[PDB]
Symmetry: D2
Subunit: 486 residues, 4 copies
């Protein structure tokens, strides 16, 4: 029965705020402890801490900065299990899923070890008569990052690694569903040799977010979450003159061509759709088999795989997928499911009544699969963020491609085929950020960049990779000339 506060200046720290938010264990439904919710006062403190520390960290040379991360990765590996447990205990996802989650953040840390090279600027000589021209990439000062429940390990790291490594000081306002991991991360960071103040964790709600966007000393805000909040966070951030990147929702389609490997496809779909209980910005929502036989045979492969999915709490190491995050979330899922039924879709596998003995209060829904889904339906238009697979049947390639093309969401997409032509055209044309050819969850590695299109992002630079070093950095340009002395 724990109380989590903030982490400001190198210490776990309770707020001055009266307010406190309670953390559930989603597998039992029960309250497990609480999160300090920051007040404007608490937030102002965080910035001050950041302000004081940042000049000197800026002044630490790139190689030294990177060695902090090299120790941080070592530390992370060391705490693989302990970090993975608190994460699974608060979020619901299997231990393996949490480890995967943390491994992915680690990988951006590995990437940022290369900051000395990643941060070099361009030089030119003889731009004029005796005139040299060169740029420098300097810190932006202080930055804030806002994080969702879905990844309370990987997405903070995604942002604070490149921001910190760049010489910035960073403030993380994470989700108050699972706030344990972000705080452990800040602690290990100092244990790795980060100065106090450089990475602060502040917990809270809309108040805290709003305090971040209005706060004059924070230059850059980074957001991942839902599209209506992202649109808000982006806009509000821009009004207060900050730079901003925001990443929102998804309704990700997997097109299956008649010539694809249906077995690989089927297996990919089962993992991509139901893994982590569908609770993912990069999960496959909608399968689009092309043609009647492909759609019949795909279904036939998939329903016994869905029915046999193993559902349990994180303490059950055999479980394929766990409980969803909250009772709010479970019910929203349940509502969508029944509307799928009301609108004429065929629920070929019905996980509505699954009940796990000794865990009745836990937020458990068995996996669900819909067939004959069409674009009018809400199960189509809406991101469900729950264990629900929609099969939409396409007559052909052109018809198939229209579906992801025309959806307001454009985060990830996958086409499954042997035909190079089919793949190149599709991956070429589709108005989506991240395209998987015979790959289901096409999330780029740390040294590339992640970002959707259309309604799934806002701004002009992605997350991690080369783009991130642009976001956390501002460019000085120097024009240099000399008169004769000696």
């Amino acid at each position: 029965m724990y109380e989590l506060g903030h982490f400001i200046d190198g210490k776990r720290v309770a707020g001055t705020s009266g307010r406190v938010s309670n953390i559930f264990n989603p597998a039992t439904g029960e309250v497990q402890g609480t999160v300090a919710l920051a007040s404007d006062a608490d937030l102002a403190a965080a910035v001050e801490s950041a302000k004081a520390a940042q000049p000197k960290w800026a002044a630490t040379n790139p190689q030294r900065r990177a060695r902090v991360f090299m120790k941080f990765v070592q530390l992370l590996n060391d705490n693989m299990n302990e970090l993975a447990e608190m994460l699974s205990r608060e979020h619901g996802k299997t231990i393996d899923d949490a480890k995967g989650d943390i491994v992915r953040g680690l990988e951006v840390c590995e990437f940022v070890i290369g900051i000395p090279h990643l941060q070099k600027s361009e030089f030119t000589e003889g731009a004029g008569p005796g005139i040299d021209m060169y740029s420098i990439r300097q810190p932006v000062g202080i930055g804030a990052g806002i994080t969702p429940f879905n990844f309370p390990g990987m997405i903070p790291m995604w942002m604070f690694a490149p921001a910190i490594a760049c010489g910035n000081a960073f403030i993380l306002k994470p989700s108050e569903r699972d706030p344990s991991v972000p705080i452990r991360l800040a602690e290990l960071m100092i244990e790795a040799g980060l100065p106090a103040g450089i990475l602060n964790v502040v917990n809270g709600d809309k108040g805290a977010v709003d305090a971040i966007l209005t706060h004059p000393d924070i230059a850059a805000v980074s957001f991942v979450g839902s599209t209506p909040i992202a649109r808000y966070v982006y806009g509000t951030a821009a009004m207060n003159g900050k730079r901003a990147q925001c990443f929102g929702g998804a309704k990700n389609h997997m097109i299956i061509m008649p010539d694809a490997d249906l077995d690989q496809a089927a297996n990919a779909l089962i993992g991509a759709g139901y893994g982590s209980a569908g609770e993912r910005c990069m999960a496959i929502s909608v399968a689009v088999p092309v043609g009647e036989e492909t759609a019949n045979r795909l279904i036939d492969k998939l329903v016994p795989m869905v029915e046999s999915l193993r559902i349990g709490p994180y303490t059950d190491e055999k479980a394929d997928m766990g409980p969803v995050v909250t009772k709010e979330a479970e019910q929203r899922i349940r509502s969508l499911i029944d509307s799928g039924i009301e609108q004429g879709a065929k629920l070929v596998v019905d996980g509505r009544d699954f009940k796990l003995q000794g865990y009745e209060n836990g937020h458990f829904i068995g996996g669900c699969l819909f067939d004959d889904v069409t674009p009018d339906m809400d199960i189509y238009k809406t991101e469900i963020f729950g264990p629900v697979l929609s099969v939409v049947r396409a007559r052909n390639y052109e018809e198939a491609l229209s579906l992801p093309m025309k959806h307001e969401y454009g985060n990830g997409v996958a086409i499954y085929t042997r035909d190079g032509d089919a793949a190149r055209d599709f991956a070429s044309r589709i108005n989506i950020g991240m395209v998987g050819v015979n790959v289901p969850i096409p999330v780029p590695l740390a040294y590339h960049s992640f970002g959707g299109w259309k309604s799934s992002s806002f701004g002009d630079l992605n997350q991690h990779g080369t783009d991130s070093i642009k976001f956390w950095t501002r460019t000085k340009t120097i024009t240099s000339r000399w008169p004769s002395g000696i």
Copy 2:
């Protein structure tokens, strides 16, 4: 009297609103010509033009795209000083200041000839077993630009040359004070073999601006102009979900260190201070000597040099500067130098007396040099944007430095010193985007980035150079794998 409309589908086109705005000859104060003020209909038509036109352009390989700009460059060079009389007649700046203004723009178009190199994306083999991962940069679709009166040749090019090279289509909403130049450029692109629709020009005021900010097919907005307005244009752009870059205005300082070549500095102060009437995002607006001595000899250098400035119409090539742009602007300068006296500053060169014979209704105002400027004064805090040079005296280096540091503006800053250390320390810490060491207008060239810091910039990407390419493209990343096929 001439009638300018918009430029849509490769054609000069009249507005559909009856709304019009006046274009003056700043030298003579009179009114030659008229600009159509775009309706929402007019704007909608430029967008529908662009929306039809771009895919096939997006589909032209980058080498063929490069070739348009190649030819376009030759075309400007052919129409160089037929294009410059145009600029000078509407704006007031001399044929040499227009000449460069266009040249600078033309350089962006030379930079963008290398779009095939420039637009390359990154590949990786075996990020995973059997697995390849690689980026591609694609057009964002349809972008738009809003440009101020000072530079109607250059800044449009800044925006549209990189936009269009990347495979996009563009709409330009220029300043209507001086809108001949923008339409001609659009007309020259056709002649260079640019598909119709890809570059549209739309004149208008705020109503057009808002029409752009809110149009759902316009993906990216680029703006240069006043700070307050930029801040508004940034905000709205974001609320409407677009990506956006905006660059505000300045109060650029120069720091003269004791050891500096006081001749070389004093010279550069006149030309950067008063050239183009002081009407620049990047002109020198404060002079900061370090020490009483340095001050004194500089003031003694400048005054005859300010006095002996030839002021007149673009039509006299002798002239070192000319008319301020509009009567509305010239009065806000006049009033600002008045607060210069009320506020305790000692004015040393007084150019309000100036009337160019017969030109009494021209927007002529001579040179103004102030001394003993304090931080408190309006004249120091506010962007005069006129032929008014303020001189602030600092006892030491650390204080000389404190001045541009503490200021709300932060586009440019120069330091004049023979000391390697003074120059490295200073350029290192100063929180200004463009930094000049012994150079008065540290404007980067087309292959570098342009952008100020603090309140002279909004957003995270800069103007021209590598950044523009990043701004006018969006990343796609492909992760790729195969199932064992006919090979086995």
Copy 3:
């Protein structure tokens, strides 16, 4: 009628007193002579280049770029004139000559971007108050040897990057078709390149040697036979110079059973028989994978070869023309014979061809061999003539071993609709340039060109960014200050 050299901005006759003949390969007989060059002739050119290079090095990258712009102007304005001189000397078609000129016009296009292409890296604060950056400065003076077949394209390949980097260039072209290189150098003065910067010296092995050992030359690039490459690279490196050399080729096309047979077949006809196949990137070996697909391949190949319109460059309707030299005609008629001697079956016999009015010109009918073996000399030596060899392969792994196992690695192609076969292939293959559903996969000027295995020596490619690497040398500066007036 009599070509000499082009030294220091105007054509000059040589002191050597020696000459090479220039045949018109259509008629067969001589039409003009080129000066061979002495050491004094060669030395006078290095002295021009030494005089002009520092002031050329001085001019900024923008002004340097502008010369190339205007040189692309003029190159278009003389397209016609140029491809005419090239054709009557080389024997390549007027349309083929046009391609030759354009393919190097496009390198010139590339180097118009040298301002950005020459940028250096800068670090700030890599130690306390210590910066470090680099500058890419001119090598000094370059040299280039070009073979007979591309007197337009390959000289430009070399000298355009070399000269844009601020260097001076000495070109020693082929004394077979030498008019184009002078005209090119002459046209460069017209664009406003200083004199002495681009000088053509003509000659044989005697001139190569005088270049290979001249102390003021730093870099050397060569294309030609592997044996000459070998030695030029060998000799350069011994004289302490830096070298890039490119050699011979035996380029296979592998047609998979699922390829688009028409498209393929059509391609063999272009790439095997274009310009009588006088090319480092021509296709020489067809490797059908099916028994059935080798059968149909031939079925649609034979009428294609047979109906090849052969004619002198003056027949603008001809596909092909004369080989460059009486000597070459003999080499190839010798190789066609060993084919028949060694078991291969000539299914189109071209030896028989004589062209009315041009009976002594080096014309030779297309030759298609079948049941070719990898033990045969038509397979392992480079014909450089109008002769395509078809090697029957039973399977993919067996087909793939042919290009892999061959001493040459210039180009390769695979024709298939299977994304799998194409990627695995391009992935593993031994060869620098790989075409998938593409016959002659020469990379564009912004990319770079080079063979692997025996087809290239050194570590940098032609054109692209590699070319800027070769004509440049890095300086690195570490900079810092004592306390003073600050």
Copy 4:
């Protein structure tokens, strides 16, 4: 006493060859041990080892390789002390100077953890109609490194880290004068998870060197050492069709301008001139004082500081200098010194007649300092590679600069001054690879590149940095199109 052979296929292994070579302790002149000298059957075994091990390593993904190097780095910090002991014992420099050795190489290992991003290639979409074009950087295959005595840790890591991270196999033939360290680095790399076969140390003679240079399955050769030996290793490699980069000798000059902080110049000269007995390719051989009021005052600060030098064995942690590497190395330095007196030089500090109580017979030489040296002298022309720093008095900036300009060697050069103009002019014009402004030893860090000009380097790619990634990979360029197939 000990016996070292080779590391081949994950193991310490004896050489099948008859021949062996002596390892001395330069402090005492004793023989501590013996290296085996490789025969061609010993090298061949190593090459087949690499041949078998390389494909699978190249098949491991960039992230997974970087990880090995990440581990290696922790292992270096773990064994820092054992390693410096072993190094210093054989070679003779301080434990402190050996720590540098390892750390300067360990930082190449850091640089390379980032290979996933470093090995990206370039992608281009629709280079033609429906044709994408892109390159892959696959490995070169099997490489080799031949390293001198002075840095038997730093310079192997220089070559093998880039090489291995690029998924290549490596063969290291280090200096047989101090071979304990490399084999340990090879062992340590096995601990880090590098597969057997991937890092092989082969110890040997010119017989080893030739064997490497003539082996059909080695694709690439890096060499550091003599200019004459560089030229040979370069020329031979090339005639066997390998690619090569060779790095040679040095005569590093330091120019002191009158406005320089002499206290600092002087202190720098102590470290850079004498540290590690001056057995560095980046050590300062020539002090070039500009003006005589400078020249006189430099010597005035310079003389006590030399004579104060503590000279001792690696075992005396207090010592600034150890012995030189061999009996032979000493005989030339003593010989060359006498040449100085013989030709005119003024020996203001005499190190000749100094031995050490208990360490007579160990190769010790007191620091020597010449004044009034000129370019005709031998101590100016030759690389001394011992504790002998020449002073050449230049009358002016221009004359001072001609000194390095004109020299056979162009490895490194420093200039010391407060003047921005002199720093820039010098750094720019000079024909030297690495340049220092108020920096004594301008060796770039691992993320930049190392390499001198003129006689000091060969080939067209430097050491470490993005250069080295380019040396250890070949480019393959794919051009891709598809025929309309199963899609509608």
